[PDB]
Amino acid sequence: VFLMKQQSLLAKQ
Amino acid sequence: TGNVLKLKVNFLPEIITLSKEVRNLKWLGFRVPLAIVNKAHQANQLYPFAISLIESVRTYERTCEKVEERNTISLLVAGLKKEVQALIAEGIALVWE
């Protein structure tokens, strides 16, 4: 879930 | 490489120190400031969730090894990938939650 964690980090900003 | 979020117990490098120092001054009759007492004991009672987070971090490492076990994992593990996505969001991507 690397891209998922990256997406979560970008969503939290 | 990676450039993504992570899931690992972060309370551990300070909750034991706060517990020991504050609680020792307490049974020692000495005093500790208000915010330190509250935040320290609440972090120590929250340390059980940090224990679950440490076990989840170990489970995440074992999950990466299990996903890198052989062929069919990385080939057909989209269900576990989506589950890891939801799990990483509920436990690692928590914004003050």
Added chain:
Amino acid sequence: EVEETLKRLQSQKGVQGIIVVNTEGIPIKSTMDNPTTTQYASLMHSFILKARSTVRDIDPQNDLTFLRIRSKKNEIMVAPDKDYFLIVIQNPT
């Protein structure tokens, strides 16, 4: 685990040379002088086979698990079983 095996085997004090003689009769994996003890262990494999037949045919309920060869010059405190015969020549004192 050859680490602990070879460790406790050759690392033991006064151990000159062991001979892990298999059914083959050649001590290729031991701490004796291989070019000198190869034929020695082969001949001793045949004669220890004679000894196995002796000790195990006259009294069939007597195995051979430890052969403390107390010689006039060396402590060949062999460590056998039904699988090997660790013919070890060791320094007496």
Added chain:
Amino acid sequence: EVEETLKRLQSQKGVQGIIVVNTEGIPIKSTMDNPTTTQYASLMHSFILKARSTVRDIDPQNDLTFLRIRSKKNEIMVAPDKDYFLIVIQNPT
């Protein structure tokens, strides 16, 4: 040191049969009967002389101080004497 000592040494704590060889190959004299002396100590003596012939082929007069073959149910000790060799069956424990 003959009668009571003979009983003391034959049925000693561990000594099953102290079957002393008589003239290095034909065991007759002992603290007990001749079959257990002759048969046992003669075959073990002959086959142990073959193994000693091999060790003797390596180094000739490096005889045995006290070959305590600690065999499983009852040890076999070979101590070479002058007129004979010592082939005695005595338990390890």
Added chain:
Amino acid sequence: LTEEEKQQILHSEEFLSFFDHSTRIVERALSEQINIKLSLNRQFFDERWSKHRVVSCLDWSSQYPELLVASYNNNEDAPHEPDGVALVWNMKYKKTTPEYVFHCQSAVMSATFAKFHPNLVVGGTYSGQIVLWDNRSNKRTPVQRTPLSAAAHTHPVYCVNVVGTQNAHNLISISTDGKICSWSLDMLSHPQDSMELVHKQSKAVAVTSMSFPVGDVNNFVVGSEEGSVYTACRHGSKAGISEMFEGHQGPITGIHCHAAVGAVDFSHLFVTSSFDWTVKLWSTKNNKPLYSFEDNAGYVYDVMWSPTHPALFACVDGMGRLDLWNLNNDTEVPTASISVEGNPALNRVRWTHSGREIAVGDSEGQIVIYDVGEQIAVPRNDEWARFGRTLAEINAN
């Protein structure tokens, strides 16, 4: 030479145990001859696995001696070795060489023997990671890994307990917070009594090396933060901690229930040793220390009662001085007393089940074994009741 096929043939599965037999019997055969009452019994120390191991508890061998787990809290003295040290030794051969090495992947803290098993060894760590070993063979890998969630522990397992028989194989693992978890000794998934030691005050009981009653009694006495003898039961109407008979100070580093009855009564008594620089006598009807012993110079850490003579204990201190006392014989003075190498702050003391010898553990490695050949078969019940009466007449004024 080129021996890979012989690595499979010669160094096979069952042949490694045979090689262990060969090494063990020849290294034992090293005791080859020529081929032509303070006595200090023994002492053992590994210069590679016991070196500078700052430990607080091990796994002694009362029953079946000459093989005792030195479950050391692996210090950073050997970082290039598996982090975890457990060393059974060979007192029968009297050796200190690293032959019976045992290791884990965490700070091995008090890895006691498992229930109904001499080979299987159970043990908690700094993070409450209770591991296990079934050494039916000559293996050393911790074959079990405890889950470490919220209900589990993340603090050092002080003194794990084995309760019951072959029917009830219960294990009581405790953290510094006092969370008791009765893991079954078969599966490391559910701890039966996975509750909290709730007491009258400070439910998060800061336990410190509790002690286990003789006779499979659940009326345990938990050693805690400032003495704090927490007397209670794990179940029944008082599943939590019922009360705290104290009068002892500091974190209890040694507490032990009744010994093995020589000729005395059951003698429902115990004792405590801690940072109050002493040991204090106790029983089941005190609520105060029955007899506070001599507050010696330094932290009195461990204490243990002897099985031969039940009315005699042994205690070391912060300056390494073992003092074994039988107040029914030697009241104001100990029965025997001897120091350790220098004057360090040790941590363990354990009587040999055979009696008249004891294995005392230092808190930095080496283990000393002293010898005291004085007691014989004597009816000490008389002296027991008489001395209890003397104390009962001395406390009055």
Added chain:
Amino acid sequence: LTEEEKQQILHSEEFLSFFDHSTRIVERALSEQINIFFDYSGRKLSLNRQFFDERWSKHRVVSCLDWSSQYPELLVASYNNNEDAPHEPDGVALVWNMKYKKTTPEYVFHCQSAVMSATFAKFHPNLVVGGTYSGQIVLWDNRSNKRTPVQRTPLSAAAHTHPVYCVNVVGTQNAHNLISISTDGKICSWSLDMLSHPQDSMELVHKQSKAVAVTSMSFPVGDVNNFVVGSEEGSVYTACRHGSKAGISEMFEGHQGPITGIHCHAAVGAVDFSHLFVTSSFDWTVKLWSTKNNKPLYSFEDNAGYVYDVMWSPTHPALFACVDGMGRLDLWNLNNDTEVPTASISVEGNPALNRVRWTHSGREIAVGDSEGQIVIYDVGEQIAVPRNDEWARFGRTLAEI
């Protein structure tokens, strides 16, 4: 000749240097003599017989397997009501050729309809008989070589008015009557020569208007002649020939459901009276009873469906040939294991053990499961030897609870 004198050398001992030095190193070796350290070290259906063939059981179903005494060891792998593969007429029996050491049948015979547990007769192994589907015990002489049923008896009230459950012989050759306890609650026994209609209509019910049937009502194994008419709700009646006890008077019931496996213990090898009339429960159990129990004396266990047949082995009164509901024919033995599967015949997967019987030779199991081949499970050691009294002992003890 080796030596002459052997007395003064041991008497006069100047040779003590060598003697005592040899024994001196012996005693020096005796200082340790360390052996092994502590170190926590320490120191039925085996291709027995079968009944299936291209001309006998080609993709058929052996829902029935008899224990015909005449030409024994021939489990009659019959064909009950089914539609698997059509080869011969309805009710094709295949009596296993175990005597000639064959996995095929020794004497196959079709019928006019699907019979219900046919068996042999006396004085010859040819004129066999068995309760057919019309209601009577159809007979046929194997010596005459007739494919279908040669002569079928009248299926009226004399025979089973309702369906059929089981047929067998009655007594020894002095009074061997063809006795069949069917699925009509009746033990009808015709004579060995007179079987044109089942004469001895010993109805194990009254004379009212109802189909008071008997589920798989077999007679007692070991020739105890107890034609146990086991109704749909226990009631394993001890249906005999005549008198005031040829029915449900001394009903050896106990089965929780339809008492189907109804066959008592065999001849007493080392057991008591061995009148333990079995009654397999439809609730996946097999409760045995006796001549003095009339309740679950030796209740066997199972966990799926309804059991169908059970008959004790004749080499051991304890050892039996019973079933269960998962293929493993849980052959029980009241002495060794009165409840679980002692001799569990490994049938094809979860085969429908619709029949379980045991020949007069015993120490085996001749059962008919979903596998067409007669699953012969040789119990072996369960032969005429001592210590078999525990069967009847456990039966009466558990009947107490």
